From a paper:
Thus, in Pgb the access of diatomic ligands, such as O2, CO, and NO, to the haem is granted by two orthogonal apolar tunnels that reach the haem distal region from entry sites at the B/G and B/E helix interfaces.
Interestingly, the location of the Phe(93)E11 side chain in the Trp(60)[name] mutant is superimposable to that of the Phe(93)E11 in the MaPgb*(III)-cyanide complex, thus indicating that the presence of the haem-Fe(III)-bound cyanide is enough to induce the Phe(93)E11 side chain rotation; it also suggests that the insertion of Trp(60)B9 side chain into the haem distal site is only a consequence of the cyanide binding to MaPgb*(III) and of the ligand-linked conformational change of Phe(93)E11 side chain. Therefore, ligand binding to the ferric form brings about a ligand-linked conformational change which leads first to a rotation of the Phe(93)E11 side chain; this movement, which is observed for cyanide, azide and imidazole binding (but it is somehow impaired in the case of nicotinamide) creates then the space for a consequent “induced-fit” structural change of Trp(60)B9, which brings the Trp(60)B9 Nε2 atom at H-bonding distance from the haem Fe(III)-bound ligand.
Author numbering:
A (entry chain A): 5 to 195
B (entry chain B): 3 to 195
Write the structure that this text describes.
């Protein structure tokens, strides 16, 4: 088990429902085919997670304004914070690949959005850090997250066609999630 | 040189609430560099001659989903074909702007405007139409995927190498993400952007 990780155990229901999710899946072109391919993506990625994490956090670490969101008040990275989040992000890779996108999934989507947002940021790990991750960067990061996965999706010898299907599934699923995470950021009634 | 109705790039009457430094830092967040400047322009060269088919594909997708076509509907629930047609011209222009404009303060000011036009702040004013008041933000983010995906097959059709196609597509992905991120502004609780 993973400190702070509360998938299936959250103490509120998402403000969006499974019909919302159906309609949003449609908007991101995500079908049963992507369910199959995202699970394949997971089989490919799961034993490469350490390099994936180094690559993702390598990017974050290289830009002071991104590393910012993990910083203590003194502007230095909070290493406790980075380490705890890293474990939860590792598990997110698997959840994205392996979970049914069902109500528990939706409820945790709400929770992850809340944790990036000022509502709950810094509470899971009991750290003193910056209060809010600007929404602009959540959207932005759809790109790096997907770009990070791409080279790894090839490393088990899958063909460019099969890799493209996995990569596209990942792209759709990452976009889907960030769309959901906007909820706590967006003015009531505008979501 | 005919005006595209409603298109007001470079003549908006608000300054964007985000500046050149905000943009630099956002470009950094989507991994956008001088290399993507090269390849986004190349992308424009390939797409510009295929826009009718690109638009038919994009709006085919929108039209195939009642909850998406919804945002172009008259209050009676029926699609407003004048609204669709006018927006289509401005979207066509946006393909060129994404490829061809320098992303400077003028570009930024139009980004803010485009976000306002999706948002209840300005939606339906540009074309003087009556329609649904707001496009739910969830769908703007969602549309990063179909907009990006729509371009991919077209990027191959001037016979660039698969590497160059992939780089054009990646530039397009970055630039689309970048813009949708900026368009969040009017939707986002003040101070949380
Ligand atoms: C595609 C966009 C993003 C994805 C997929 C993503 C993924 C994740 C995941 C899976 C977690 C842990 C969730 C949990 O608690 O179980 C997390 C937390 C966190 N992420 Fe992100 N993230 C994204 C955007 C960002 C950005 C732009 C930043 C800025 C550096 C960032 C920094 C953080 C921080 C500081 C936490 C801890 C929040 C807290 O205090 O609970 N994330 N992210
Ligand atoms: C990647 C996301 C999106 C992109 C790149 C995009 C692109 C554009 C562009 C370029 C325009 C015209 C801008 C101008 O006035 O010069 C526009 C307007 C419009 N778009 Fe989008 N769009 C996106 C998301 C959406 C979604 C999800 C919908 C829902 C159907 C939508 C529906 C509309 C509508 C109804 C207008 C007219 C708004 C008004 O009344 O002014 N767009 N869009
Ligand atoms: C976010 N890591
Ligand atoms: C959107 N058009």
């Amino acid at each position: 088990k993973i400190p702070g990780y509360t998938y299936g155990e959250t103490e509120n229901r998402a403000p969006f429902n499974l019909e919302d999710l159906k309609l949003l899946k449609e908007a991101v072109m995500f079908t049963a085919e992507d369910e199959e391919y995202i699970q394949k993506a997971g089989e490919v990625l799961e034993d490469q997670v350490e390099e994936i994490l180094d690559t993702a956090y390598g990017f974050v670490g290289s830009h002071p304004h991104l590393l910012y969101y993990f910083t203590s008040p003194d502007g230095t990275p909070n290493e406790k914070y980075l380490a705890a989040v890293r474990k939860r992000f590792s598990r997110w890779i698997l959840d994205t690949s392996n979970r049914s996108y069902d109500q528990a999934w939706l409820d945790y989507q709400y929770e992850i959005g809340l944790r990036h947002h000022r509502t709950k940021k810094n509470q899971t790990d009991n750290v003193e850090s910056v209060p809010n991750i600007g929404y602009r960067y959540l959207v932005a990061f759809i790109y790096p997250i997907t770009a990070t996965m791409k080279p790894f999706l090839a490393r088990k010898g899958h063909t460019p066609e099969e890799v493209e299907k996995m990569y596209q599934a990942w792209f759709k699923a990452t976009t889907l999630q960030v769309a959901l995470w906007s909820y706590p950021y967006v003015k009531y009634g505008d979501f």
